[PDB]
Design a protein around this nucleic acid. Structure first.
Length: 118
RNA sequence: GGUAUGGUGGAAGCGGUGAAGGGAAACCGAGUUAACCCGCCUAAGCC
């Protein structure tokens, strides 16, 4: 499901974006909530973590992100993001719905995937 | 009358790879599951 390579520091900027968006606005976390967030177009950003077995459980979500034109990014460890998502469990995927104070920043980080193509 | 299988107070397992628990399902989306000691409140159900 890993479509494009990402910097780990940029993944960190994304993670901090998920924290700030968690506190100041609405988000969803785990594949179910987050794919449902895409399908309903509420997803303003999709955060995937690459350490996932089975791969397939996340595999369906990234194409939909380009299919519904929702930005998507990778983060090194689902555990670290689950902690960033404010839960006690590793979370393979997360979505920012309401960016909150993170909004501008996420736009900027979104720009990176715009570049990440090809 | 009495009696915790209900509840209050005190010195290891399932779980966002979706737990329990509601619900016919859709759908919810975060914590649940503890007979262990005493000492309190309660009486369905029981003698």
């Amino acid at each position: 499901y890993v479509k494009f390579e990402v910097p780990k520091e940029l993944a960190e900027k994304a993670l901090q974006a998920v924290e700030i968006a968690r506190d100041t606005g609405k988000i969803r976390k785990g594949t179910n909530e987050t794919t449902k967030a895409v399908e309903r177009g509420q997803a303003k950003l999709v955060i995937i973590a690459e350490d996932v077995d089975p791969e397939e459980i996340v595999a369906h979500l990234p194409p939909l992100c380009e299919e519904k034109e929702i930005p998507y990014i990778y983060v090194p460890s689902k555990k670290e993001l689950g902690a960033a998502a404010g839960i006690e469990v590793a979370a393979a995927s997360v979505a920012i719905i309401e960016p909150g104070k993170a909004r501008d920043l996420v736009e900027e980080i979104a720009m990176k995937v715009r570049e990440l193509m090809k």
